[PDB]
Design a binder for this molecule. Structure first.
Ligand code: BEF
Ligand SMILES: [Ca+2]
Ligand SMILES: [Mg+2]
Length: 890
């Protein structure tokens, strides 16, 4: 009927009896089908939400929610209410074409090229009516009895009542590399403050390392340790991306300036005494043209292109604004347990009793790897000492690795991987174990007795593995260069010094011995077990440091491993300092601001502490790219800027928290994202420059026409066509222009800055001045003596169109010019240029088009003269750009 959802705190406080009776849970019979169904109906399913996928309706509707779109719609309405329908129809057709093309492209391409993000369902074991039933964890109910074995994943919060040497790896939500032993007796309230201190509870999403246990589920759904994190992350209003705010501000400023200039032009015309209707129509057309109606479309196109480029490099970006925020990052955080270093112990250094030093290459529980001693490769039984050490580590073992997954203790898995690297994966099968001494905390050693299966007549050989202090007590002799010599005090001191040196580097020293009987075994050597960083981590870190981006590391694990990992990655200096989470919480934030950017190591931290660190780093002004792979980081990933979550060794919460998903865990992918973002920003800047130059030229031409009271060189239809060309498919083609190698070697962009540079403004002004001067010269040559003809208007329109095409051609690359990118790469820009040229030709040479547009036919000689005249601006622009770049670079 009614069951309270017991938290791990209270459940840990209480014992088995009243916890079981509170939930009406039977420890042996479990729950019946009817009770399970009722609990399912009340509490719901055990799995989390699956979010909501937006259908096409409001996805297409939202494209009309831009303020510029509202302005365009209002302008079209006022145009259709003047009983003309021409400008209204043209504007409606243009906006419909642009919006439909952008919507179909984005929706279809994103829905077709983002179907590789598939997940897998979890598994669990349940007992009902005394029968062990294999059922999914997705249907679990509170009060169920769940059996825990080696290698399985804990399905929910389990109140353990029976446990036999159970070991659970909780690094997913705590970050502690060392597994914590699990007990049955309730914990005191005084020691029940920390999450890891709960040794009598089982957390969801953790992996059982060793032992077997049975527990009763206390909380299923959104009311667990994952549930509280999800509740805290529910709203979690993230800051808006800088690109969107900057684009909105630029668009608003441009619209305000255009409206002011339109009002000034209208006032001047009213004082000049001209036709109010024609002036109003021209002002409306100019207001439509000047404001950027294609800037959001080109931004969306560039973001989609970046998403596809990321996908081609095994990445997932399930939203638009992510692509243009990684390049602005100045500081990058990283979690040691899962992102920089996997949760896998691998032997790296082996010490031999005779003084030989061995280095092991390779990571992971796989046969990949190489063992090199004195610069020579050792495989199989080539080196008797290393072979004996590997045999001791493999035969005296209890863990088995199946399908690159470890079932057993991490050190045993490291030993098995080391044996696999030399090709001795099946070495344990040649010995039949007879007597076993299980490893225990008190003894701190494990010993086994075994004989060869084909050599049973051989005397029994005992292999012992454990701590150096315990193995040396049962050791009396050692092997040196194939000779058995008595172990002396000097050799013991040398071994102790070697162990201390290994420990100073963060290596976990493990001792090995072999002999016929206990108390006589022969020392073989020491093996260094340590969690190693991923192969593609050091190079990426070095590249990021050389790029001018600071890197910080948050550990959440013991201090020694933190400093060792930081030193191995080069992020820690011997003169640097680290601060714990308790000191951060106790000490006031007002002074912590000066201490947050000078440090990069945080051995002890909490999800709320990580969020506080994130907020402090962001409050002074910066963009933070913090990664993560567990629930410990999920809230920090969500409540920050762009975050990258590993999609292989990760949880179902980090994938949703972080937009960037790597199906394969790697770090070099961030550099490609930064380069693509820089290229997208360069393309956006070039498009903005071209649009601003065209708008400024048109505004200056109209102002000059209105000022000295001479007939306007262009009508409403020509201005509308110019606007369509300026902010149409040709405009969107400027953002699809391919990337280059010049902007790649550039340091992170600094925000709170204007996108218009001095050189860009000067180039825009020069282009506008040249276009206006050419148009004025053509006009003066047209109506020179006494003639006024619509052919003059057609010539002016053609000259303006040709100038726009030439400006667009030269604006494709900000630093390159013609004959540098190839010019014949089958460009959508070239296709759009050809289409616009054919449309202009059709308009010029069609009696209906000539009637509506008030134009006239031209001649071949006139076309040749126009082509030869509308080419000076591009040549001089490219020449001045080349000479300026050469003088300022060489
Ligand atoms: F070390 Be992290 F918190 F997984
Ligand atoms: Ca426009
Ligand atoms: Mg982690």
């Amino acid at each position: 009927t009614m069951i309270p959802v017991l938290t791990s705190k209270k459940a840990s406080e209480l014992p088995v009896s009243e916890v079981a009776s509170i939930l009406q849970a039977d420890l042996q019979n479990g729950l019946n089908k009817c009770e399970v169904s009722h609990r399912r109906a009340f509490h719901g399913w055990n799995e989390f939400d699956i979010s909501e996928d937006e259908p096409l309706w409001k996805k297409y509707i939202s494209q009309f929610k831009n303020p510029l779109i509202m302005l365009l719609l209002a302008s079209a309405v006022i145009s259709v209410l003047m009983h003309q329908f021409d400008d209204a129809v043209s504007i409606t057709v243009a906006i419909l074409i642009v919006v439909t093309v952008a919507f179909v492209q984005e929706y279809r391409s994103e829905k077709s090229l983002e179907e590789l993000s598939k997940l897998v369902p979890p598994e669990c074991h349940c007992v009902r009516e005394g029968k062990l039933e294999h059922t999914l964890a997705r249907d679990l109910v509170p009060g169920d009895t769940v059996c825990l074995s080696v290698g399985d994943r804990v399905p929910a919060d389990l109140r353990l009542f029976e446990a036999v040497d159970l070991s659970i790896d909780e690094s997913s939500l705590t970050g502690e590399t060392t597994p914590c032993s699990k007990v049955t007796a309730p914990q005191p309230a005084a020691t029940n403050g920390d999450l890891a201190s709960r040794s009598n509870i089982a957390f969801m999403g953790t992996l059982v390392r060793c032992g077997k246990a049975k527990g009763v589920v206390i909380g299923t759904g959104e009311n667990s340790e994952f549930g509280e994190v999800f509740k805290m992350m529910q709203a979690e209003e993230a800051p808006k991306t800088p690109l969107q705010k900057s684009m909105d501000l630029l668009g608003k400023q441009l619209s305000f300036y255009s409206f002011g200039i339109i009002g000034i032009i209208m006032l001047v015309g009213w004082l000049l005494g001209k036709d109010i209707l024609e002036m109003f129509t021209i002002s409306v057309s100019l207001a439509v043209a000047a404001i950027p109606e294609g800037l959001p479309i080109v931004v969306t196109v560039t973001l989609a292109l970046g998403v596809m480029r990321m996908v081609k490099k095994r990445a997932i970006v399930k939203k638009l604004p992510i692509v243009e925020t990684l390049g602005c990052c100045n500081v990058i955080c990283s979690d040691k347990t899962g992102t920089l270093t996997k949760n896998e112990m691998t032997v790296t250094h082996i010490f031999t009793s005779d003084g030989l030093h061995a280095e092991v290459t390779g990571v992971g529980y796989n046969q990949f790897g190489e063992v090199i001693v004195d610069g020579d490769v050792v495989h199989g039984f080539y080196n008797p000492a290393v072979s004996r050490i590997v045999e001791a580590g493999c035969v005296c073992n209890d863990a088995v690795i199946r399908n690159n997954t470890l079932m057993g203790k991490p050190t045993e898995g490291a030993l098995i991987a080391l044996a696999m690297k030399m090709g001795l994966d099946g070495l344990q099968q040649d010995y039949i174990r007879k007597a076993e001494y299980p490893f225990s905390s008190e003894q701190k050693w494990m010993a086994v007795k075994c004989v060869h299966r084909t050599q049973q007549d051989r005397p029994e050989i005992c292999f012992m593995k454990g701590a150096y202090e315990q193995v040396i007590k049962y050791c009396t002799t050692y092997q040196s260069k194939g000779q058995t010599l008595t172990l002396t005090q000097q050799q013991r001191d040398v071994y102790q010094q070697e162990k201390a040196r290994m420990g100073s580097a963060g290596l976990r020293v493990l001792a090995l011995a072999s002999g016929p009987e206990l108390g006589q075994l022969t020392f073989l050597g020491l093996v260094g077990i340590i969690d190693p960083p991923r192969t593609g981590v050091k190079e990426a870190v070095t590249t990021l440091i050389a790029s001018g981006v600071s890197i910080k590391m948050i550990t959440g694990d013991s201090q020694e491993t933190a400093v060792a990992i930081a030193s191995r990655l080069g992020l820690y200096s011997k003169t640097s300092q680290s601060v714990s989470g308790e000191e951060i919480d106790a000490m006031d934030v007002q002074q912590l601001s000066q201490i947050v950017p000078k440090v990069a190591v945080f051995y002890r931290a909490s999800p709320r502490h990580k969020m506080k660190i994130i907020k402090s780093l962001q409050k002074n002004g910066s963009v933070v790219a913090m990664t993560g792979d567990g629930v410990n980081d999920a809230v920090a990933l969500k409540a920050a800027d762009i975050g990258v979550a590993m999609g292989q060794t990760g949880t179902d919460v980090c994938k949703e928290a972080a937009d960037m998903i790597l199906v394969d865990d790697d770090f070099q992918t961030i550099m490609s994202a930064i380069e693509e973002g820089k290229g997208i920003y360069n393309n956006i800047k070039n498009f903005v420059r071209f649009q601003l130059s065209t708008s400024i030229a048109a505004l200056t031409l109209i102002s000059l026409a209105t000022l000295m009271n001479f007939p306007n060189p262009l009508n409403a239809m020509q201005i509308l066509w110019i606007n369509i060309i300026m902010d149409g498919p040709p405009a969107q083609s400027l953002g699809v222009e391919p990337v280059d190698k010049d902007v790649i070697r550039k340091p992170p962009r600094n925000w709170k800055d204007s996108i218009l540079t001095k050189n860009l403004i000067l180039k825009i002004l020069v282009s506008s001045i040249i276009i206006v001067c050419g148009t004025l010269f053509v006009f003066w040559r047209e109506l020179r003596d006494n003639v006024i003809t619509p052919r003059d208007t057609t010539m002016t329109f053609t000259c303006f169109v040709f100038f726009d095409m030439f400006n667009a051609l030269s604006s494709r690359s900000q630093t390159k010019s013609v004959f540098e990118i190839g010019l014949c790469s089958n460009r959508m820009f070239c296709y759009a240029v050809l289409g616009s040229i054919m449309g202009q030709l059709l308009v010029i040479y069609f009696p209906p088009l000539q009637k509506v547009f008030q134009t006239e036919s031209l001649s071949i000689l006139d076309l040749l003269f126009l082509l030869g005249l509308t080419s000076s601006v591009c040549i001089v622009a490219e020449i001045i750009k080349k000479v300026e770049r050469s003088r300022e670079k060489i």
